[PDB]
């Protein structure tokens, strides 16, 4: 159930006297819960344990740092939305243009969050858009939808090397690095219909969440 | 003793760009000012003529042609409309080397004398080199003025010009100081070696005129190796003696610029000195070294970190473009695809949005690097370039200036050492840490038989509380000049009993390796002040 005042995450504190490869304990793991305010929410501008952007009371998205091998640190990108705020309306003839953000990380740098701009456009159930980096205008990803599922989107990369990544990728719509996108239509608390779009996707090379919002 | 005996062995000259700024028409390469190509001049200037009768677009073009062909001396400014020559003559002199100084201007047909009041050994040197005496002048004299002549010229020369036409001439009146005299330097008249200083070119001058701030040598060799300045001369931090009038006059005369900090007649000929200063303002200016216990963001935008796997093996220094400076032993070619570059971050476990990561494309390790003595422990890291980007840019990183001479900083200068090194009791440090250290004049006592002064540099704290530990290798040893510009003086090479007093950290003297880096990265990317 949605609770922006208590959201699950992990607080990872490093081992103060951790030796260099002498022991496998280098950080300590505990369960923590946070209350989110409007806008981006984080603790330390130098060592953030969590980034979360509260677009509206009905939805938030972000990531929390997590580990599985107790020796390497990875980012777990997640999103949540109010169940009653999700819109189940028909959209086969729905037209709009959407703006938002796309956070992701790569396999070689799992702990480094990477920002990207996302542009979305719906015309009569047909979806198209483009993804750009923060500081430069390179085409990173392509939004192309399914004719019988506006709620579902396939995403494929268009560059050999993602920002903050050393892993080589395959380009083209036939690339094996595609992944599916589940889009949730969110109505804002003020009564605007389908005000925000959220969704998360993951490959073994990269994983992230899509944070999207209605412009017109 | 105002003269530094140690520096004199280096026989620095006016062309030594490690000790004096090059002229606008030269370039500093392998520690020597090399003359630019006439093409290389800035296109803004005034047309001039040489004694050979050819016109040149700018004064610096003529100076470069001078630097290749000595016989092509500057004659007059403007177009070569008139054919009037520029000659100097000596009269009323027992020996052809001596006599009253008389100058015939290019635009004036009457030979007439020069005033004695504004007459110095610099103008005498210029006059003698103009007459053909390569070794310049010997002394100066003021004789009585001709009662039949009431007009004379006051002349001002920088001291490096090849002819008086490059000097400035002003209208003057015969005053009580009379007219100027000169005796050109000759081997027979050279002073005894006992009480004489030896110029690089062989000229002998009295010891009292060495390191006096006055350019008494032909090539300035008497004013580049000094412990203190005699009389009114101003002493640079780098041991250069400069006259007082060059202080607070608007151009950098000392290498570190301390001469310009804390600063609040009818023209017979054009001011070629004003042209030279004006030309200096058009050389490209490099923007580096300026910024917009644990540290914070932006305190070290030049701080680079190389990661091997999940551990930061060593630190690094950003230099510009896709180039990073790091100790040679910190990297190996065989692990080419494993290194990662991390920037603009404080915690490696918790990087922020501002943190970006780049791959390594090429690594250059110095050829003469020795793995046993740690000599020449420098490596250059070439960051992987974005294929669709014409130029490698890091939006959130500011490169730090690389020193071009080993004389930028002196012993006991305050410098900053930083890195991710080990804490006390070998505790793991997960945040960028920075400390202050002081440079040491001597270090051979602490490390006899292993310390090399030309290549290795020793610094540390008196109490030893703050010191670079293991893992600080590749870390910066940065210093700030009088202008608050950050220079990367050294990179962490090795340390014995890190954190203990009397065992200072040892850092490779990066300034000694400016030529190697510049030849590997492109000189114009990292060079300032035509160097
Ligand atoms: C690295 O430096 C060491 C120390 O000088 C060199 O080893 C000695 O080099 C001298 C040079 O004349 C020889 O006379 C000795 O016989 C060497 N001794 C040993 C044990 O090697 C070493 O050669 C240098 N190596 C490189 C690659 O520069
Ligand atoms: C040099 O002259 C050109 C010609 O118009 C002018 O555009 C430029 O500003 C000048 N540069 C300097 C440094 O005077
Ligand atoms: C520097 O150390 C060496 C070590 O042998 C010594 O010979 C020399 O005199 C020292 N110079 C000083 C202290 O100025
Ligand atoms: C840095 O700037 C401050 C500004 O007043 C100045 O006081 C200080 O001396 C400068 N640092 C150096 C090393 O000159």
Residue numbers in the entry:
A (entry chain B): 103 to 318
B (entry chain A): 48 to 311, 322 to 349, 362 to 600
Provide passages from the article that reported this PDB entry.
Here, we report that PmSLP binds host complement factor I (FI) and facilitates cleavage of complement components C3b and C4b independently of any cofactors (e.g., FH, C4BP), thereby allowing the pathogen to evade host defence. We show that PmSLP-1 not only exhibits a high-affinity interaction with bovine complement factor I, but it also serves as a co-factor for factor I to promote cleavage of complement C3b and C4b. This protein-protein interaction thus plays a crucial role in modulating the complement activation on the bacterial cell surface and increasing bacterial resistance to complement-mediated killing.
